Amino acid sequence: DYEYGVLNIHLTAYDMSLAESYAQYVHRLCNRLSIKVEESYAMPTKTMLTTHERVVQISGLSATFAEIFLEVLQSNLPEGVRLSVREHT
Amino acid sequence: WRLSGALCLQRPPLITKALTPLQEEMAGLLQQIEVERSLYRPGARETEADKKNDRTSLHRKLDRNLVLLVREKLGDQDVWMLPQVEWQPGETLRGTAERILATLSENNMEAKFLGNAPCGHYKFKFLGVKVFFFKALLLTGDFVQAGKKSRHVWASKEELGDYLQPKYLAQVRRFLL
Amino acid sequence: EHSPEESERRALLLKRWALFKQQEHEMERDAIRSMLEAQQEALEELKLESAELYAEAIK
RNA sequence: GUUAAUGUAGCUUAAUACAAAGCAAAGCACUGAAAAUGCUUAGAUGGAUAUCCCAUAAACA
């Protein structure tokens, strides 16, 4: 018996507001799908200019649900934002 | 009983839907205020322009999703099928699913099997046989040998009905987009 | 910077864009339900022929 | 075709009366997230009696 793990999506965008707007937008999209989001953590600045990364916690996926979800997420991606999918520690 | 396994491969849409011009100009406006209120060779956009007929090539479409569809030959049958391979009960569906990824396609496609539960099963009889349709999501696909001797076609659902007539093969749309 | 007329024009279509998304989500949610129900339907189909094979699948 | 499902809007036997209702869901604003809150968005009798029914989709086929 196995189920989809809890995978954090790190929304990395140079502009904080753009990431926040997508973070609010993507989370609201998750509300449509009823996807549980435990937390939205903020990473420190990517000091070298700096960039801002925002975690969108995602818990619980299904085989058919997962395939549609990623497709919706891609289309939602407004501009110059890089998506990421990584298993939580 | 003869056991035959198949995989319903899913190709992600690489390119997002284009934003409206008002969104772009609105994006410019929010971009400017964001700085004020800030708190602390690439591949071609569409690689289909040159081909126009390479259904075999994985990159038949980039804006939309695709599903691999491979002509298959059996001992007594030769019909257009979803990617299919012969499997044994000892191997689990994911293990059989993995074999389909390399056996039929022999490519370095990037696939992860997160859900072991299958999405499609249909029985075809003339000898009792059944087809297993697995489900998986692709982050990206690197399909080697685009021009194979096989008639593999990447089409999500548009060509599924055209090539797969019977309900045992035309109902694959039920779990597809 | 958008003009006040532009905001009014955008405001009208933003409602349509919200409406377009809202209709899509209802279909999308129902589509998942059919797909999930179809996935359950696929689960039942092979169970009749051979339940032992699912023993590996359910893992 | 035989069995069988299944047809007010995600849900409801809310309703056929004085309303096609209530609930779920939705945009934006409000910036930990969520929830709350303000301002806003879209809808059904696919169908009859006063059970068949055509459509749909299954085991038989």
N-terminal to C-terminal alpha carbon distance within chain C: 56
Q: How far is C35 from chain A (nearest CA, A)?
A: 6
Q: Which residues of C3-38 are buried (b: 16+ CB within 10 A; e: fewer)?
A: eeeeeeebeeeeeeeeeeeeeebeebeeebeebbeb
What are φ and ψ of residue A58, in 5° steps? -130, 125
In this complex, the answer to whether residue C21 has its CB under 7 A from any atom of chain D, a nucleic strand, is yes
Which nucleotide's C1' atom has the smallest distance to the CA of C27?
D10
Instruction: Report which residue is nearest nucleotide D42 when distances run from CA to C1'.
Output: C19
Question: Which amino acid, residue A27?
Answer: H
DSSP-derived 3-state class of residue B86:
strand
Closest CA to A69 of A37, A26, A39, A40: A26
Q: Which of B46, B71, B50 is nearest to B61 (CA)?
A: B46
What's the CA gap between B114 and B97, in Å, rounded? 12
Please give the backbone phi and psi of residue A7, each rounded to the nearest 5 degrees, phi first.
Answer: -115, 125
Nearest nucleotide to the CA of C22, by C1', is: D26
Tell which phi-psi region holds residue C12, choosing left (phi > 0), alpha (psi between -120 and 50) or beta.
alpha
* Residues facing B130 on adjacent strands: B3, B123
3-state secondary structure of B99: helix
CA–CA separation, B65 and A71 (whole Å): 8
Extract the tokens encoding B30.
């929010």
Count Cβ atoms below 10 Å from residue B142 Cβ, excluding itself.
9
Please name the method used to determine this structure: cryo-EM
CA of C30 to C1' of D19 (A): 28
Give residue A76's region: left, alpha or beta (phi > 0; psi -120 to 50): alpha
CA atoms in the 13 A half-sphere facing the CB of B66:
22
Q: Which of A16, A67, A74, A76 to mutate to test the interface with B (most CBs of B within 10 A)?
A: A67
Task: Assess contact for A32 and A65: CB atoms under 8 A.
Answer: no
Give residue C56's Cα distance to chain centre.
Answer: 29
- Residues contacting residue B147 through CB under 8 Å, at least 6 positions apart: B54, B56, B57
Nearby residues of A26 by Cβ (< 8 Å), 6 or more positions away: A9, A11, A56, A73, A76
Q: Which two tokens stand for residue B46?
A: 């569409």
DSSP tag of A59: B
Residue type, position A18, single letter: L
The residues near C58 (Cβ < 8 Å, ≥ 6 apart) are A1, B116, B117
Which structure tokens are listed for A89? 């520690």
Contact A15, A22 (CB under 8 A): no
The phi-psi region of residue A34 (left if phi > 0; otherwise alpha if psi is between -120 and 50; otherwise beta) is left
Are the CB atoms for C51 and B129 separated by under 8 Å?
no
Whether A70 CB is under 7 Å from strand D: no
DSSP string, B4-68: EEEEE--B--SSPPPPPHHHHHHHHHHHHHHHHT----PPPS-SHHHHSS-SSSGGG-SSS-B-E
Q: Which chain C residues are within 8 Å of A65, Cβ to Cβ?
A: 32, 36
What gap in Å lies between CA B142 and CA B136, rounded to an integer?
A: 16
Query: In this structure, are strands B84-86 and B2-8 parallel, antiparallel, or unpaired?
Result: antiparallel
Tally the residues of chain C. Answer: 59
* H helices, E strands: number in chain A: 2, 3
The token pair at B108 is 């370095």
Asked whether the beta carbons of B59 and B48 are under 8 A apart, the reply is: yes
The helix or strand, by DSSP H or E, that contains position A46, with its residue range, turns out to be none
Q: Round to whole Å and give the CA distance between B99 and B105.
A: 9
* Cα–Cα dist B50/B56, whole Å: 14
Resolution of the experimental model in angstroms, please? 4.6
DSSP C17-31: HHHHHHHHHHHHHHH
* B22 touches A: beta carbon within 8 Å: no
Positive or negative CA dihedral for B121, B13, B43, B55?
positive
Mutate to test the interface with A, among B137, B140, B173, B177 (most CBs of A within 10 A): B137
Sheet of B68-73: strand order equals B78-81, B68-73, B153-154
B10 chain-A contacts, CB cut-off 8 A: 67
- Whether A11 contacts A83, CB under 8 Å: yes
Cα separation values, B55 from B8, B67, B103, B135, B160, Å: 17, 11, 20, 21, 13
